[PDB]
Amino acid sequence: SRKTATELFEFLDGLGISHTTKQHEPVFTVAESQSLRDLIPGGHTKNLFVKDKKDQYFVLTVEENAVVDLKSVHKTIGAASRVSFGRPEKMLEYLGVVPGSVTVFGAINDTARQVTFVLDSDLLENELVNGHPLSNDQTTTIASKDLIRFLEATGHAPLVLKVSE
Amino acid sequence: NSRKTATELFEFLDGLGISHTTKQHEPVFTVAESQSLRDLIPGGHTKNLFVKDKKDQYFVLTVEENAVVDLKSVHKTIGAASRVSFGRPEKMLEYLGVVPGSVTVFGAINDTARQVTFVLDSDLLENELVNGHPLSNDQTTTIASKDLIRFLEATGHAPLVLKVSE
Numbered sequence: 001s002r003k004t005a006t007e008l009f010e011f012l013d014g015l016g017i018s019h020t021t022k023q024h025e026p027v028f029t030v031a032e033s034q035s036l037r038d039l040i041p042g043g044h045t046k047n048l049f050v051k052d053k054k055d056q057y058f059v060l061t062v063e064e065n066a067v068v069d070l071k072s073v074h075k076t077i078g079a080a081s082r083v084s085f086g087r088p089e090k091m092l093e094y095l096g097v098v099p100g101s102v103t104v105f106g107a108i109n110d111t112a113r114q115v116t117f118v119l120d121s122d123l124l125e126n127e128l129v130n131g132h133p134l135s136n137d138q139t140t141t142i143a144s145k146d147l148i149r150f151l152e153a154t155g156h157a158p159l160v161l162k163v164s165e
Numbered sequence: 166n167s168r169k170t171a172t173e174l175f176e177f178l179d180g181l182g183i184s185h186t187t188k189q190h191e192p193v194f195t196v197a198e199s200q201s202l203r204d205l206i207p208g209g210h211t212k213n214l215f216v217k218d219k220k221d222q223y224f225v226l227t228v229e230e231n232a233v234v235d236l237k238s239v240h241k242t243i244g245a246a247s248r249v250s251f252g253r254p255e256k257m258l259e260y261l262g263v264v265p266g267s268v269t270v271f272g273a274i275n276d277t278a279r280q281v282t283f284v285l286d287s288d289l290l291e292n293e294l295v296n297g298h299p300l301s302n303d304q305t306t307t308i309a310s311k312d313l314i315r316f317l318e319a320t321g322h323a324p325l326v327l328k329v330s331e
Contacts, residue, residue: 028265028266029214029215029251029257029265029268030212030213030214030215030268031214031215031216031236031249031251031252032251034214034234034236034251035236035250035251038236038237046196047196048196048197048200049195049196049197050197065231065233067231068200070197070200070201070204071204083197084201085195085197085198085201086197088195091195099194099195099198100194102195102196
């Protein structure tokens, strides 16, 4: 069963992870999305859901303005081939999210631990990081060190690697 | 309000003598799927910021997909009256004939009242070729960067070519 935002917050509370959240209308355009980010301190995350030819799945979580070279990233992350995008059926199955609502907090839904989470080194140089708490009408801030603790608590030992250009 | 079809756009470009090529594709939404698609399509890929100032002067800033615009300062570069604010969907549809998820520099063809000032980032125009959705997000169309300027001019939009990216 996919978790709700409330269930995510409760899980963070049980872990002793502090969080704050802004409620907002979902945003879509380039200027409106940026305008919203600029009101919310911290690194804002974006996620690449990918796989290799052996059907090993990864989420690469990077800062919003970072660029990943999809032709080469496999070599950094230990993938079996050049990566391909993961299709939505496995994205739903594993992370409980749909396109437009992808979030690193989706780790909580991957109870079979099919996804390897990679966190970009530069992203974690931010004191605070942001993602949607399983809903796109909220943005939640946690400490970057607590993102690691969150992932570990869901059974996902993250790889911290430089995947951004 | 004008809301032309992709066909109408192509015919307009044909009458201008602007060569175009288009890739048909399912619409893409995720980060990796969008990037994978861009990597198959040569040229600079465009993204657009639809903004206004306190005097309700509207602008479209068209930049390369991986560029960043400093929204706190860009008004000084483009000659706006104040720090800019995002343009809301009503006016975006009224002027450009586009909705969220389908914003495109080709929407200039819909701005028949010429309410929007188009600004092209100078770095973007160093690409020989540039890409945008031809008024539909299941296609991506490539034209020469100099032809993007010709297209804008033809629609009655003299573009400002300025460094608006960081």
